[PDB]
Amino acid sequence: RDKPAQIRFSNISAAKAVADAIRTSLGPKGMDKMIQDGKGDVTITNDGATILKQMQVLHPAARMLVELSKAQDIEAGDGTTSVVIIAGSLLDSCTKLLQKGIHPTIISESFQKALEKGIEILTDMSRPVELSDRETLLNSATTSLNSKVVSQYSSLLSPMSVNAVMKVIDPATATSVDLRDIKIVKKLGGTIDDCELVEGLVLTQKVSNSGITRVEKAKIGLIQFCLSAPKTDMDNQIVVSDYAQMDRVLREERAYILNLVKQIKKTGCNVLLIQKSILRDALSDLALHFLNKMKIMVIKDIEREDIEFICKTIGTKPVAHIDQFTADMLGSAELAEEVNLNGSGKLLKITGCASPGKTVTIVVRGSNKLVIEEAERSIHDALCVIRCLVKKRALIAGGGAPEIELALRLTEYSRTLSGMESYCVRAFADAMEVIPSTLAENAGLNPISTVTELRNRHAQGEKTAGINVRKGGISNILEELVVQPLLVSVSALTLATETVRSILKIDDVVNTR
Amino acid sequence: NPIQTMTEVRARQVKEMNPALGIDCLHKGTNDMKQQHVIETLIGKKQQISLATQMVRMILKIDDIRKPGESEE
Amino acid sequence: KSRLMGLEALKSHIMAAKAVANTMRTSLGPNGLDKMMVDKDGDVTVTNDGATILSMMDVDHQIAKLMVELSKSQDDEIGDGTTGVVVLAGALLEEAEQLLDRGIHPIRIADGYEQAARVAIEHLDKISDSVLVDIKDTEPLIQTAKTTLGSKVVNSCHRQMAEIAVNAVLTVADMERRDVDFELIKVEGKVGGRLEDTKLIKGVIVDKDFSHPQMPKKVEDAKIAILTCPFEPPKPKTKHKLDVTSVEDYKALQKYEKEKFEEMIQQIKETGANLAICQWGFDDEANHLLLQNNLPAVRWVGGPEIELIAIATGGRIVPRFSELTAEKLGFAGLVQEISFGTTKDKMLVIEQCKNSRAVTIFIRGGNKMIIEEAKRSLHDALCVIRNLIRDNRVVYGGGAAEISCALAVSQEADKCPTLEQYAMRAFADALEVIPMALSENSGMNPIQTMTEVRARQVKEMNPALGIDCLHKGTNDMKQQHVIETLIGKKQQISLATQMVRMILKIDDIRKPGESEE
Amino acid sequence: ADEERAETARLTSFIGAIAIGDLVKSTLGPKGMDKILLSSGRDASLMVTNDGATILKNIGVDNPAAKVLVDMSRVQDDEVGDGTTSVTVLAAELLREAESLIAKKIHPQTIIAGWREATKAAREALLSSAVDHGSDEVKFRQDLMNIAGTTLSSKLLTHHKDHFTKLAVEAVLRLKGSGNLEAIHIIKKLGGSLADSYLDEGFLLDKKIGVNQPKRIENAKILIANTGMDTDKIKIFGSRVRVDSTAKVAEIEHAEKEKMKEKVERILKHGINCFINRQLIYNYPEQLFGAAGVMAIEHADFAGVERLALVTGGEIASTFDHPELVKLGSCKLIEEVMIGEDKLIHFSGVALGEACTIVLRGATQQILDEAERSLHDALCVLAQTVKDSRTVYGGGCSEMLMAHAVTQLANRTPGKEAVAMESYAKALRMLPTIIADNAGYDSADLVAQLRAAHSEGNTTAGLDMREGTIGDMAILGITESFQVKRQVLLSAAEAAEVILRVDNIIKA
């Protein structure tokens, strides 16, 4: 009906309309925003990338957008804006086709036909670089890092990401070193220079107090047993109508736990990961006080995250009641280490831990969290670009100019396809050229000159050459010091090839009731 | 289908260029030019090429979009 | 308020009947169309039955309330005859209003219908005044339950239902008493059954079954313990339930309830009744003690139903445990938990043959509608069959009689100088809408349809043949077997014409509005 | 009460089912354009749906007419398979069909019987177009396959659909006439494997056994229990409640530790190292059971016991206390294995047979869900494939043949009902239209010709709407049980015919 017709167009309406002003992409371009929200606010906003993740846009075709943005991050670590900058690119071509009247499902597989050959033309413009190679790993991450918020510390950050990978990497060629493997662990204090690359499992948790075990022979594990005592796990018959009945159980409570924490340290435990479960207590506050007397690293109701890494990295198993002693199913740990640097932060480091050949823990330090997070975000794209090299071997360009390099080509590929899709894919095949101008777009006056000529420049640079979007001027973008692993950009097509095609499917609307 | 038609010879143009074939102007099952016997003096099409290109140029003529108040008045 | 009279309420009268009658005349008979009707509860009810439509509606006017109630009489009386008595009652208003529009005073036209309603029921009398007995009627009863069962569009193979309705009505409503009795018919049935699965169980079938399979699944003839005694929580009119909060309070709760039921199950078995049917039936704890004393017996029974095993079984009554004696016991021919082939319908028969004071039809169907389908099918069959069992009096229906009745009166109208000839005309003129509306539900020209029969009724001078009530192409009330109790044929008339009359004598209306139900 | 009248209720009966009969038929036919279920009414979300009920049912039905079809096509789906899409559309199509007739006021008496007869005409034409491919067992295997091929087709499954091409046929064959999840026990679990599913030996369960219990047991004699513990087992002494003051609030949670220990003792009277129950425990009780020597294997699969008991000769029962009331069983090995990143305890030693276990690994539950349902429809339709091995060519060939044979019958047989009988045939040809656009291909030049074309006798030939072409429905394997196809002809007629007989809707 008209609803299926309009709602697609209405979906094409919203999502496309968002993706346009979603392109100032990168640059020092366009004026800063407070945001007064839909239900109201004042939200001072910057950097559309995070803004994309921040973006709440609520509309049937708007929700796929925030998704689309977030995926290219987890897909690459880069191109977060880039998947959306080609999203509205797809969102246009559909119209002229549906304006030509072409069937949307016939338009649908055209996206595949666009995605199918598009990645190969990308694979053609891909300059393959070694995924295990220190230099390619350094250099590719360096382009991200030099573009990241710390280009200085990048020099220290890249080999960390290079070594984080090469440890975690499968030897020689690998699709490996996930962001799950890598455990990025902040540490208050230290320095970005003191950001530490640990091959092993460092759990970011804050160790109880200090002066506890830094020594060797840890036993770390998530222990779901609790420390019994009177008025803890143990039965009492005594209701308190009096003050003495209140005190008596306590005198027996703290003493019996004090002898339970021994059994824990008797087990050989320089750490425990306490079950988030309690009865009245589980491990009491005095208990931890008693466990720490025995130099057992304790964090009460430990964060569920470090629970998994120790079970993921070390293979930790449930442990028997401390009155049953233990199963020694605490994971294998030869070091319980609490590091304090800048005199700040409590960081459990389990080294000598059972490790697959993976799970690097990059310890991120700095004089401030903001100091911490700069490199932490920077080393991430150092990790991810390298990880993008690992997952896929190439160096293409960044910035979206090689999209125009696919565009001149994929046009003709349609022209060779000679189908109705040759009109469908081609309508987009050129429409992908839009981004380099729309990056530039949102700032000033006297607009026009650069916009049209950009795609023209590369078009005059033909297939082999074109204008660098970041550095300007016509030179082949693939190797510039504007570069990406091809994994970055190809996923942007994939992600957008589909969620956009998903709109072509929508006929009318429903609301689950 | 106007699309798939253009598509059709579009395949054929990828196949063969300047074909004695073509579409069906007579709507014959065969899509030809020779055997449609559709054809034009290469004068004509070129002459026909000139005109719209001429006119789509003539809309561009010089500058003036001002009228006395009278342009179509 | 406002006193609303003259055409004011005369509309408010003629208004309500039309919206009412039409869904009924579009649902009229088998050709009548099956109307999904959904509550404010959001629940689909498909109604081809005007009475069920009446049961589904309450339309706002006092008559629309009473019209729902009007058919219920003949629905109780005759069963079938629910839809026609209403749909035509509004047609009189059509007739009458125009007649008042002709200037004929309302009480004038009001009277002539009833005045002409004589020949209406009187011309019917001449068709079949016959009377037959159970074994004779069963053929006309199934022949009428060709139509009556099929009136719900379920008669197929259901001569089973007809034949069990044959012997059901005579049992309860005697041919000699000529008094309406459905009371000793025990309506029984369960969802999940079949239309083709239906039973007349002359005794009473109780839902509950034997407390254990280890205890025998047969109780012998008679020797049933009819009692009000607790074997589970008593559930009197009002008492609040307090439970046990302690360990030392829990243990003794098990011992006592063991100690009394044993003696009680003993004393019952010692009383000599091998089925204990207790108005307060068994808990699951009383079951094992019942197995300890090894007696077959029944769990929770409805309060009055223990009387229903006292009346229907001829067993002389013992009200309660305290009075137990071997003399007064419940009776059963044979006690069996019976599955009919759908275990979804599972009953323990307390079987009555020698003395059966409640006959039990057991109806089955796959769904809630399908039972109800078969239920209102057979129940309306049951009543016409009851009418026919007392006196088997039929007519060739579907308007074939309406035309033949329309002859005399409309003729007899002009025979009279009296004003009521117009009424008598419009009386006999209002009759024929039924085959008309039928032919419309039958999907034919309604207008010639009536006259096709009068062309016959010219030739015939009697309903035998008719138009198509079944849309099967044979134009018959005879070999098509449109055959229904001539009683209920006369019940629609007297109910329709005399109710409308009582509606007509009242144009005097004090309501805040015009039509108030 | 509130009575919808002849004018509105039927047009409401028209629109509502037609309004719900639109979305699933876009999804429908070869290369059917997917419907995107939009959930803004519960959460705010998008859902990609080819699925009739997922489209239908996830939208609550308000309109009385929208009730029946979504209700009738639903049971048609659980019964005969993929009925939510067909019967909804097909009835909504006939509702689209009735309107011109109703605009002409073709009698509600006439249309029902007209569509009643023409229903047989297509059902007979479908039957006429239906031919057994199950003449030979391997052909019947393929017949089961070719019919499952139409059943399993056009879903988001990838290795599942192919896994159930054999698995249904393998289960339907060795059951000799049936299909079941008792012959193959579905286990839908997480894992790195996306659509990968295989036939399990014994059965596996999702949990890890830590603490002092060894994660693997040898010479395991299964003690099957429908009974287990809640970590608290209600009995005479288990009712203790001491809570009055806040101190008794502190004492009460600790009594649970007293309660957990005595439960271990009832199993020791049985004297078995391996005790399986259908109920679960925490870690702290996991600390108790492995210490006493009787290993607690918790929350045994209901189908898992049935998996063993069918092959191992064990018996399924209820209310376990002592080993006698529920027959024992034997696993060669009780072990815990590493499946992807999932750590699962696994029973085995019995391989396949009468009862099988089917482990479904997936990235999401989405890829897991269709597999059991696509099999669900396959098994029943392949059970139907046993009753009628008739496989009539799907993808419109069955459809475009029926309306043909209906037509000539819809002509002379009625002197009137050609109004209905032909309108019936029209709906049969509507499904090929709503796909043709979804194929981008012309309905018209196709349908009337290609029907007549293959109604003039090219039966293998038919509608390939993958490519949009006139295509062979044999080599494509687009064909399906005459049963599954006859049954969706049965319901939708009524769902259209029922609300036609509804001229009025009273609201009490």
Side-chain angles (χ1 to χ4, degrees), chain C residues 19 22-23 26 31-40 42 56 58 251 441-443 471, chain D residues 1 3 5 64-65 67 107-109 236-237 239-240 499 501-508:
Chain C
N22 290 286
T23 184
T26 58
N31 293 139
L33 306 165
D34 300 348
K35 267 68 175 180
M36 163 173 71
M37 294 175 176
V38 296
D39 291 341
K40 61 183 176 296
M56 178 64 182
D58 50 350
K251 293 180 180 296
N441 286 337
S442 299
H471 184 64
Chain D
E3 173 180 354
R5 296 289 289 174
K67 297 177 180 178
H107 298 291
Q109 185 67 59
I236 296 177
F237 295 164
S239 64
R240 291 174 293 181
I499 58 189
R501 292 179 63 85
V502 182
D503 300 346
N504 292 282
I505 301 190
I506 294 187
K507 292 180 178 178

Short mmCIF file of all heavy atoms in Angstrom, two decimals, chain C residues 19 22-23 26 31-40 42 56 58 251 441-443 471, chain D residues 1 3 5 64-65 67 107-109 236-237 239-240 499 501-508:
data_model
loop_
_atom_site.label_atom_id
_atom_site.label_comp_id
_atom_site.label_asym_id
_atom_site.label_seq_id
_atom_site.Cartn_x
_atom_site.Cartn_y
_atom_site.Cartn_z
N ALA C 19 -33.69 -3.31 14.21
CA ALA C 19 -32.29 -3.68 14.42
C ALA C 19 -32.19 -5.07 15.02
O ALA C 19 -31.35 -5.88 14.61
CB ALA C 19 -31.61 -2.65 15.33
N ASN C 22 -33.42 -8.11 12.36
CA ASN C 22 -32.74 -8.35 11.09
C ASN C 22 -31.53 -9.27 11.25
O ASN C 22 -31.35 -10.20 10.45
CB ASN C 22 -32.34 -7.04 10.44
CG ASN C 22 -33.53 -6.26 9.93
OD1 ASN C 22 -34.12 -6.62 8.92
ND2 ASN C 22 -33.89 -5.20 10.63
N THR C 23 -30.70 -9.03 12.26
CA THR C 23 -29.63 -9.99 12.54
C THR C 23 -30.21 -11.37 12.82
O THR C 23 -29.57 -12.39 12.53
CB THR C 23 -28.77 -9.52 13.71
OG1 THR C 23 -27.68 -10.43 13.89
CG2 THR C 23 -29.58 -9.44 14.99
N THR C 26 -31.37 -12.56 9.28
CA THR C 26 -30.17 -12.96 8.56
C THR C 26 -29.53 -14.20 9.17
O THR C 26 -28.80 -14.91 8.47
CB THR C 26 -29.17 -11.81 8.52
OG1 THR C 26 -28.84 -11.42 9.86
CG2 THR C 26 -29.75 -10.62 7.78
N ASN C 31 -30.25 -21.69 6.56
CA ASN C 31 -29.77 -20.65 5.66
C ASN C 31 -29.40 -19.38 6.40
O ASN C 31 -28.62 -18.58 5.87
CB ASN C 31 -30.81 -20.31 4.59
CG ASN C 31 -31.06 -21.44 3.62
OD1 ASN C 31 -32.20 -21.70 3.24
ND2 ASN C 31 -29.99 -22.12 3.22
N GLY C 32 -29.95 -19.16 7.59
CA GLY C 32 -29.52 -18.07 8.43
C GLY C 32 -28.04 -18.12 8.69
O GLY C 32 -27.44 -19.18 8.89
N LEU C 33 -27.43 -16.94 8.69
CA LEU C 33 -26.00 -16.81 8.58
C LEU C 33 -25.38 -16.72 9.97
O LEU C 33 -25.99 -16.20 10.91
CB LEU C 33 -25.69 -15.58 7.73
CG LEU C 33 -26.43 -15.71 6.40
CD1 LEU C 33 -26.48 -14.41 5.65
CD2 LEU C 33 -25.81 -16.81 5.54
N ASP C 34 -24.17 -17.26 10.10
CA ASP C 34 -23.61 -17.48 11.42
C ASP C 34 -22.84 -16.24 11.87
O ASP C 34 -21.80 -15.91 11.31
CB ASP C 34 -22.68 -18.69 11.40
CG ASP C 34 -23.40 -19.97 10.99
OD1 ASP C 34 -24.64 -19.96 10.95
OD2 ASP C 34 -22.72 -20.97 10.71
N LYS C 35 -23.34 -15.58 12.91
CA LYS C 35 -22.86 -14.25 13.30
C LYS C 35 -21.90 -14.33 14.48
O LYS C 35 -22.33 -14.56 15.61
CB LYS C 35 -24.01 -13.33 13.68
CG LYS C 35 -24.54 -12.47 12.57
CD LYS C 35 -25.22 -13.29 11.53
CE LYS C 35 -25.84 -12.41 10.49
NZ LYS C 35 -26.51 -13.21 9.45
N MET C 36 -20.63 -14.08 14.21
CA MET C 36 -19.63 -13.77 15.23
C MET C 36 -20.09 -12.53 15.98
O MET C 36 -20.39 -11.51 15.37
CB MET C 36 -18.26 -13.56 14.59
CG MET C 36 -17.23 -12.86 15.46
SD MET C 36 -15.58 -12.83 14.72
CE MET C 36 -15.80 -11.68 13.37
N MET C 37 -20.18 -12.64 17.30
CA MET C 37 -20.56 -11.54 18.17
C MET C 37 -19.63 -11.49 19.37
O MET C 37 -19.64 -12.41 20.20
CB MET C 37 -22.02 -11.68 18.61
CG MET C 37 -22.99 -11.55 17.46
SD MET C 37 -24.71 -11.87 17.89
CE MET C 37 -25.50 -11.48 16.33
N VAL C 38 -18.86 -10.42 19.48
CA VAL C 38 -17.78 -10.33 20.47
C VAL C 38 -18.19 -9.39 21.59
O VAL C 38 -18.71 -8.31 21.33
CB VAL C 38 -16.46 -9.87 19.82
CG1 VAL C 38 -15.99 -10.89 18.82
CG2 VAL C 38 -16.63 -8.52 19.15
N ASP C 39 -17.93 -9.80 22.82
CA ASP C 39 -18.31 -9.02 24.00
C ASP C 39 -17.45 -7.77 24.12
O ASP C 39 -16.56 -7.50 23.31
CB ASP C 39 -18.13 -9.87 25.27
CG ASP C 39 -19.13 -10.99 25.37
OD1 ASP C 39 -20.17 -10.93 24.70
OD2 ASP C 39 -18.87 -11.95 26.13
N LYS C 40 -17.73 -6.99 25.16
CA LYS C 40 -16.74 -6.08 25.73
C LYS C 40 -15.65 -6.86 26.45
O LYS C 40 -14.64 -6.27 26.86
CB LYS C 40 -17.40 -5.10 26.70
CG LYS C 40 -18.07 -5.78 27.88
CD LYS C 40 -18.78 -4.78 28.77
CE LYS C 40 -19.51 -5.49 29.89
NZ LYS C 40 -20.59 -6.37 29.35
N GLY C 42 -14.04 -9.08 24.88
CA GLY C 42 -13.19 -9.49 23.77
C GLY C 42 -13.36 -10.93 23.36
O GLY C 42 -12.38 -11.56 22.94
N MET C 56 -27.23 -12.86 23.31
CA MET C 56 -26.04 -12.03 23.15
C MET C 56 -26.37 -10.55 23.29
O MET C 56 -25.62 -9.78 23.89
CB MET C 56 -25.38 -12.32 21.81
CG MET C 56 -24.17 -11.49 21.53
SD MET C 56 -22.83 -11.79 22.69
CE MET C 56 -21.64 -10.61 22.11
N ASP C 58 -28.57 -7.20 24.53
CA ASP C 58 -29.71 -6.54 25.14
C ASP C 58 -29.86 -5.16 24.49
O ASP C 58 -29.04 -4.27 24.71
CB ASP C 58 -29.53 -6.45 26.66
CG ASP C 58 -28.18 -5.89 27.05
OD1 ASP C 58 -27.32 -5.73 26.16
OD2 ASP C 58 -27.99 -5.60 28.25
N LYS C 251 2.76 -32.75 63.24
CA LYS C 251 2.69 -34.21 63.32
C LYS C 251 1.27 -34.69 63.63
O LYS C 251 0.74 -35.57 62.94
CB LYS C 251 3.67 -34.73 64.38
CG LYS C 251 5.14 -34.54 64.04
CD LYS C 251 6.02 -35.08 65.15
CE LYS C 251 7.50 -34.89 64.84
NZ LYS C 251 7.92 -35.68 63.65
N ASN C 441 -31.79 -15.43 3.14
CA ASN C 441 -30.76 -16.28 3.71
C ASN C 441 -30.49 -17.49 2.83
O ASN C 441 -29.36 -17.99 2.78
CB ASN C 441 -31.15 -16.73 5.12
CG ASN C 441 -31.03 -15.63 6.14
OD1 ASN C 441 -30.28 -14.67 5.94
ND2 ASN C 441 -31.75 -15.76 7.24
N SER C 442 -31.52 -17.96 2.12
CA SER C 442 -31.32 -19.04 1.16
C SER C 442 -30.68 -18.52 -0.12
O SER C 442 -30.33 -19.31 -1.00
CB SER C 442 -32.65 -19.71 0.83
OG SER C 442 -33.25 -20.28 1.98
N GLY C 443 -30.54 -17.21 -0.25
CA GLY C 443 -29.90 -16.64 -1.41
C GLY C 443 -30.68 -16.81 -2.69
O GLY C 443 -30.13 -17.22 -3.71
N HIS C 471 -31.35 -24.80 0.84
CA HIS C 471 -30.57 -24.39 -0.32
C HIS C 471 -30.11 -25.61 -1.12
O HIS C 471 -29.10 -25.55 -1.84
CB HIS C 471 -29.39 -23.52 0.12
CG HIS C 471 -28.58 -22.95 -1.01
ND1 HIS C 471 -29.09 -22.06 -1.92
CD2 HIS C 471 -27.28 -23.14 -1.35
CE1 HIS C 471 -28.15 -21.73 -2.79
NE2 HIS C 471 -27.04 -22.37 -2.46
N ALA D 1 -27.37 -5.34 22.92
CA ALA D 1 -26.05 -4.85 23.26
C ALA D 1 -25.57 -3.98 22.11
O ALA D 1 -26.38 -3.29 21.48
CB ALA D 1 -25.11 -6.00 23.51
N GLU D 3 -24.44 -3.88 18.53
CA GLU D 3 -24.57 -4.77 17.38
C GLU D 3 -23.96 -4.12 16.15
O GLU D 3 -24.53 -3.17 15.60
CB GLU D 3 -26.04 -5.12 17.14
CG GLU D 3 -26.30 -5.90 15.87
CD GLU D 3 -27.77 -6.20 15.69
OE1 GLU D 3 -28.56 -5.89 16.61
OE2 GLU D 3 -28.15 -6.69 14.62
N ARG D 5 -23.52 -4.04 12.33
CA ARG D 5 -24.56 -4.41 11.39
C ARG D 5 -23.96 -4.89 10.08
O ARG D 5 -22.74 -4.99 9.91
CB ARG D 5 -25.53 -3.25 11.21
CG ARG D 5 -26.26 -2.91 12.50
CD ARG D 5 -27.29 -3.98 12.85
NE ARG D 5 -28.42 -3.94 11.94
CZ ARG D 5 -29.41 -4.83 11.93
NH1 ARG D 5 -29.41 -5.86 12.77
NH2 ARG D 5 -30.40 -4.69 11.06
N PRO D 64 -12.52 -8.45 15.87
CA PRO D 64 -13.07 -9.82 15.89
C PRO D 64 -12.72 -10.64 14.67
O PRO D 64 -12.50 -11.85 14.79
CB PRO D 64 -14.58 -9.58 16.01
CG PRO D 64 -14.79 -8.16 15.56
CD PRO D 64 -13.58 -7.45 16.06
N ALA D 65 -12.67 -10.03 13.49
CA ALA D 65 -12.28 -10.78 12.30
C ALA D 65 -10.79 -11.06 12.29
O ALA D 65 -10.36 -12.14 11.85
CB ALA D 65 -12.68 -10.02 11.04
N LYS D 67 -9.16 -11.69 14.80
CA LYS D 67 -9.03 -12.83 15.70
C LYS D 67 -8.94 -14.14 14.93
O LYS D 67 -7.90 -14.80 14.93
CB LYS D 67 -10.22 -12.88 16.66
CG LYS D 67 -10.36 -11.70 17.59
CD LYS D 67 -11.61 -11.84 18.43
CE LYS D 67 -11.79 -10.66 19.37
NZ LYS D 67 -13.04 -10.75 20.17
N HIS D 107 -25.17 -13.59 -2.79
CA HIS D 107 -25.80 -14.03 -1.56
C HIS D 107 -24.80 -14.71 -0.63
O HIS D 107 -23.95 -15.49 -1.09
CB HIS D 107 -26.94 -14.98 -1.86
CG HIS D 107 -28.03 -14.37 -2.67
ND1 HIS D 107 -28.87 -13.41 -2.17
CD2 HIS D 107 -28.42 -14.60 -3.95
CE1 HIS D 107 -29.74 -13.06 -3.11
NE2 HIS D 107 -29.49 -13.77 -4.19
N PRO D 108 -24.85 -14.40 0.66
CA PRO D 108 -24.01 -15.15 1.61
C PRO D 108 -24.32 -16.63 1.60
O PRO D 108 -23.45 -17.44 1.95
CB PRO D 108 -24.36 -14.50 2.95
CG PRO D 108 -24.82 -13.12 2.59
CD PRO D 108 -25.56 -13.29 1.30
N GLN D 109 -25.53 -17.01 1.20
CA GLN D 109 -25.79 -18.42 0.90
C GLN D 109 -24.97 -18.88 -0.29
O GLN D 109 -24.40 -19.98 -0.27
CB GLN D 109 -27.28 -18.62 0.62
CG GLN D 109 -27.67 -20.06 0.42
CD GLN D 109 -27.52 -20.88 1.68
OE1 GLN D 109 -28.13 -20.58 2.70
NE2 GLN D 109 -26.71 -21.93 1.62
N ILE D 236 8.55 -32.81 57.65
CA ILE D 236 8.01 -32.56 58.99
C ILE D 236 8.81 -31.47 59.70
O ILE D 236 8.25 -30.48 60.18
CB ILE D 236 7.99 -33.85 59.81
CG1 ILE D 236 7.04 -34.88 59.19
CG2 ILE D 236 7.57 -33.56 61.24
CD1 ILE D 236 7.02 -36.21 59.90
N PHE D 237 10.13 -31.64 59.78
CA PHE D 237 10.99 -30.71 60.51
C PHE D 237 11.41 -29.50 59.68
O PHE D 237 11.98 -28.56 60.24
CB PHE D 237 12.25 -31.42 61.02
CG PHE D 237 11.98 -32.49 62.04
CD1 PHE D 237 12.95 -33.44 62.34
CD2 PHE D 237 10.77 -32.55 62.71
CE1 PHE D 237 12.72 -34.42 63.29
CE2 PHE D 237 10.53 -33.53 63.66
CZ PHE D 237 11.51 -34.47 63.95
N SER D 239 9.70 -27.19 58.43
CA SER D 239 8.79 -26.07 58.59
C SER D 239 9.22 -25.09 59.67
O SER D 239 8.49 -24.14 59.96
CB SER D 239 7.38 -26.59 58.91
OG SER D 239 7.35 -27.28 60.14
N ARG D 240 10.38 -25.31 60.29
CA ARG D 240 10.82 -24.45 61.39
C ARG D 240 10.91 -23.00 60.95
O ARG D 240 11.61 -22.66 59.99
CB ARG D 240 12.18 -24.92 61.91
CG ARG D 240 12.15 -26.25 62.64
CD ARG D 240 13.54 -26.75 63.02
NE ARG D 240 14.35 -27.09 61.86
CZ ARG D 240 15.60 -27.56 61.94
NH1 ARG D 240 16.17 -27.72 63.12
NH2 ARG D 240 16.27 -27.85 60.84
N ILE D 499 -16.52 -15.54 8.63
CA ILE D 499 -16.90 -14.16 8.87
C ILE D 499 -17.78 -13.60 7.76
O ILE D 499 -18.40 -12.55 7.95
CB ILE D 499 -15.65 -13.28 9.07
CG1 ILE D 499 -14.73 -13.36 7.86
CG2 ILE D 499 -14.91 -13.70 10.34
CD1 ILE D 499 -13.40 -12.71 8.09
N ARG D 501 -20.43 -15.44 6.71
CA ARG D 501 -21.69 -15.77 7.36
C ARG D 501 -21.94 -14.87 8.56
O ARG D 501 -23.04 -14.86 9.12
CB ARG D 501 -21.70 -17.24 7.77
CG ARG D 501 -21.73 -18.19 6.60
CD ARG D 501 -21.72 -19.63 7.06
NE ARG D 501 -22.91 -19.95 7.86
CZ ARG D 501 -24.07 -20.33 7.34
NH1 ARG D 501 -24.22 -20.43 6.03
NH2 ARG D 501 -25.10 -20.60 8.14
N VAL D 502 -20.93 -14.09 8.96
CA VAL D 502 -21.16 -13.10 10.00
C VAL D 502 -21.54 -11.82 9.29
O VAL D 502 -20.70 -11.15 8.69
CB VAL D 502 -19.90 -12.88 10.85
CG1 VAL D 502 -20.18 -11.87 11.96
CG2 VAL D 502 -19.35 -14.19 11.37
N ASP D 503 -22.82 -11.47 9.35
CA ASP D 503 -23.27 -10.17 8.90
C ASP D 503 -23.42 -9.20 10.06
O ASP D 503 -23.61 -8.00 9.82
CB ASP D 503 -24.60 -10.29 8.15
CG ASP D 503 -24.49 -11.18 6.93
OD1 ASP D 503 -23.36 -11.50 6.52
OD2 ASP D 503 -25.55 -11.56 6.40
N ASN D 504 -23.35 -9.68 11.30
CA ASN D 504 -23.62 -8.84 12.45
C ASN D 504 -22.72 -9.26 13.60
O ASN D 504 -22.50 -10.46 13.81
CB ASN D 504 -25.09 -8.93 12.88
CG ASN D 504 -26.03 -8.32 11.88
OD1 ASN D 504 -26.18 -7.10 11.81
ND2 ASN D 504 -26.68 -9.16 11.08
N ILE D 505 -22.22 -8.28 14.34
CA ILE D 505 -21.42 -8.54 15.52
C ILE D 505 -22.01 -7.75 16.67
O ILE D 505 -21.92 -6.51 16.69
CB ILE D 505 -19.95 -8.17 15.28
CG1 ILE D 505 -19.39 -8.97 14.10
CG2 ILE D 505 -19.13 -8.43 16.54
CD1 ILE D 505 -17.91 -8.87 13.93
N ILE D 506 -22.59 -8.45 17.63
CA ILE D 506 -23.12 -7.84 18.84
C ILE D 506 -21.98 -7.77 19.84
O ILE D 506 -21.13 -8.67 19.89
CB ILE D 506 -24.32 -8.63 19.40
CG1 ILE D 506 -25.49 -8.54 18.43
CG2 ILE D 506 -24.73 -8.11 20.75
CD1 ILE D 506 -26.76 -9.16 18.96
N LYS D 507 -21.91 -6.67 20.59
CA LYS D 507 -20.92 -6.53 21.64
C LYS D 507 -21.61 -6.45 22.99
O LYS D 507 -22.16 -5.40 23.35
CB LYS D 507 -20.02 -5.30 21.41
CG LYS D 507 -19.11 -5.45 20.20
CD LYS D 507 -18.23 -4.24 19.99
CE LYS D 507 -17.30 -4.44 18.79
NZ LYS D 507 -16.47 -3.24 18.52
N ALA D 508 -21.53 -7.53 23.75
CA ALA D 508 -22.07 -7.56 25.10
C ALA D 508 -20.94 -7.23 26.05
O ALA D 508 -20.94 -7.61 27.22
CB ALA D 508 -22.67 -8.92 25.41
#
